[PDB]
Design a protein around this ligand. Structure first.
Ligand SMILES: */C(C)=C\C(=O)N1CC[C@@H](n2c(=O)n(-c3ccc(Oc4ccccc4)cc3)c3c(N)ncnc32)C1
Length: 265
């Protein structure tokens, strides 16, 4: 879906991310959108444009919807669903004093549903983390930037030894061999659940990249958050099996989450 940039009205700046400065505006006068401006030189644009066609066809209620791109000028624009409440980590860190444990479980369910959709399309996120989940005006958490790191040039972000890499959300098979799969997303999902139930602490907030890799190499894990019940910790902990093939699928993870919701009501 190519959008005509003459149909965009820019209203407010939402700040600047890694891929680009992003603004809030309206599309054809009526529809809320976010508009990302993609910095020249930051992404393999021709490869991204081919992949943008696939992301355009990803559609799930718990996935931030990509509405289209503007590619007949430079910089290219990404037009997406507007998420009034911003980053999940900021959201957790804003009203953490207000959340009920029932609310934290629903957020986990939101992300799991999005990932189950992605898993059903054999589409890897590649960088699942709270830093790319957003929250709408109804408090719904949505997954964002899915599959965006494959097109990033910067050498440190892509490299697994870079100072940009998400070591602390990376599974062993990624850190050792750059072996991405659904099971690497599962690992990250477990870490994300830790972030949600930890009200947005950085995992291993005191550790370097190297020390974290050594920790995971020794088979050690993040601890149970005080706010996490026994059952919920078991689900998230299951995502961190040393053997990728022993980790659950998002469908199985989801059913487990629904089972605890039925159990905790
Ligand atoms: C916090 C999780 C991220 C962050 O750095 N923010 C500063 C600006 C603000 N924000 C956005 O960055 N986005 C957003 C993210 C991703 C896209 O493109 C997209 C979505 C899905 C797949 C690929 C690309 C566009 C814009 C915001 C959005 N949509 N709404 C509201 N605030 C956003 C948070």
């Amino acid at each position: 879906m190519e959008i005509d940039p003459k149909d965009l009205t820019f209203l407010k700046e939402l700040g600047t991310g890694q891929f680009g400065v992003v603004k809030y505006g309206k599309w054809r006068g009526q529809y809320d959108v976010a508009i990302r401006m993609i910095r020249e030189g930051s992404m393999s644009e021709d490869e991204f444009i081919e992949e943008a066609k696939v992301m355009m066809n990803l559609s799930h209620e718990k996935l931030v919807q990509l509405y289209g791109v503007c590619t007949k000028q430079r910089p290219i624009f990404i037009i997406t669903e507007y998420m009034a409440n911003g980053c999940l980590l900021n959201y957790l860190r804003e009203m953490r004093h207000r959340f009920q444990t029932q609310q934290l479980l629903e957020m986990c369910k939101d992300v799991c549903e999005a990932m189950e959709y992605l898993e059903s399309k054999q589409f890897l996120h590649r960088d699942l983390a709270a830093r790319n989940c957003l929250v709408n005006d109804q408090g719904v958490v949505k997954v964002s930037d899915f599959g965006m790191t494959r097109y990033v040039l910067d050498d440190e972000y892509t490299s697994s030894t870079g100072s940009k890499f998400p070591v602390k959300w990376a599974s062993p098979e990624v850190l050792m061999y750059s072996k991405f799969s659904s099971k690497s997303d599962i690992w990250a999902f477990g870490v994300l659940m830790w972030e949600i139930y930890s009200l947005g602490k950085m995992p291993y907030e005191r550790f370097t990249n190297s020390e974290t890799a050594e920790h995971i190499a020794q088979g050690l894990r993040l601890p149970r958050p005080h706010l996490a019940s026994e059952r919920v910790y078991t689900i998230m902990y299951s995502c961190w099996h040393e053997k990728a093939d022993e980790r659950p699928s998002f469908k199985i993870l989801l059913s487990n989450i629904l089972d605890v919701m039925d159990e905790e009501s």
